[PDB]
Amino acid sequence: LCRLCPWDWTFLLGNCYFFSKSQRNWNDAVTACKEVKAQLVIINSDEEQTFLQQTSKAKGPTWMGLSDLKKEATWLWVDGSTLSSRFQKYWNRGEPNNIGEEDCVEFAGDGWNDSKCELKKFWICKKSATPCT
Amino acid sequence: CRLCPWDWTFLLGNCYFFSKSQRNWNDAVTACKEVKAQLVIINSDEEQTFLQQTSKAKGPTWMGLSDLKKEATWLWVDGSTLSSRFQKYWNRGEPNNIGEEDCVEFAGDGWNDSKCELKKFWICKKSATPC
Ligand SMILES: CC(=O)N[C@H]1[C@H]([C@H](O)[C@H](O)CO)O[C@@](O)(C(=O)O)C[C@@H]1O
Ligand SMILES: CC(=O)N[C@H]1[C@H]([C@H](O)[C@H](O)CO)O[C@@](O)(C(=O)O)C[C@@H]1O
Ligand SMILES: [Ca+2]
Ligand SMILES: [Ca+2]
Ligand SMILES: [Cl-]
């Protein structure tokens, strides 16, 4: 009867998140989320970052939909929006480093790293949920 | 790496299943027992927060709390006593209708007590398996 998210996706605050069980490079992951009409995960709330951060820690490193592939040092979400000042706090100390060599962002432990996009990692999709009358 | 069974949500070392249908309280207990889980027991505030918002999207939802053993004492389905640190979650004006509304539900932003005969959504919880 009342189903908020696709089967095996988790509901959180009006959206549905899918946690990959396997690992892929950054671009593939984008493609993988695209294939289910979703986006490699974009963060725009702290409750979200807290929920996503904890899941990832139990699995391991996990890609999010953030990168500076358009322009070194500028960090864009796949929807084109710029990284907000309110989120810089999520960088781990010593991150981001290796600018121009590590162009994609991952959850790592308790914060974000930038990394070689070529590496395979777990990933996460996000799309909007569907209500119940 | 699979933390929880298919269509179950991982949270802080446990697994959660959200029903798509509604059942009276005792049935819901049964349903949980069918999959080696319990009608949900809260023991953390991050947990209470997650469930609360999830229920909101669906509708009133049962948890594994009741005073069926003894009017006015609220025990979890596992027999454990309700903690002082969690009393804050009763909505204002809850618990009421004591001795007539014997089971606890998520309702809005806190907990109500309700007639156990009512059909409501439910949530099961059981421990996860790591990677
Ligand atoms: C492999 C190595 O020797 N040092 C690595 C350090 C260490 O990880 C940190 O000093 C502590 O973890 O930082 C990187 O991983 C990073 O995030 O870009 C790359 C770098 O090559
Ligand atoms: C006259 C009277 O006793 N009324 C009832 C009230 C009201 O239900 C609440 O005040 C909410 O309006 O309180 C009880 O729930 C309670 O706490 O035991 C039962 C009680 O029988
Ligand atoms: Ca880095
Ligand atoms: Ca009531
Ligand atoms: Cl399974």
UniProtKB/Swiss-Prot annotation, chain A:
The gene is Cd209b. It comes from Mus musculus (Mouse). The lineage of its organism: Eukaryota, Metazoa, Chordata, Craniata, Vertebrata. The chain holds residues 191 to 323 of 325 of the full protein. Probable pathogen-recognition receptor. May mediate the endocytosis of pathogens which are subsequently degraded in lysosomal compartments. May recognize in a calcium-dependent manner high mannose N-linked oligosaccharides in a variety of pathogen antigens. Is a receptor for ICAM3, probably by binding to mannose-like carbohydrates. Disulfide bonds join C5-C16, C33-C125, C104-C117. It is found in: Membrane. In vitro, is a receptor for HIV-1, HIV-2 and SIV, but does not transmit virus to permissive T-cells under the conditions tested. Ca(2+) binds at E95, N97, I99, E102, N113, D114. Residues 11-126 form the C-type lectin domain. This is CD209 antigen-like protein B. Glycans are attached at N113. Expressed in skin, spleen and lung, probably in a subset of dendritic cells. Detected in spleen extrafollicular paracortical areas including the red pulp and marginal zones, and at lower levels, in the follicular area. Detected in skin suprabasal areas adjacent to the epidermis and in epidermal cell layer.
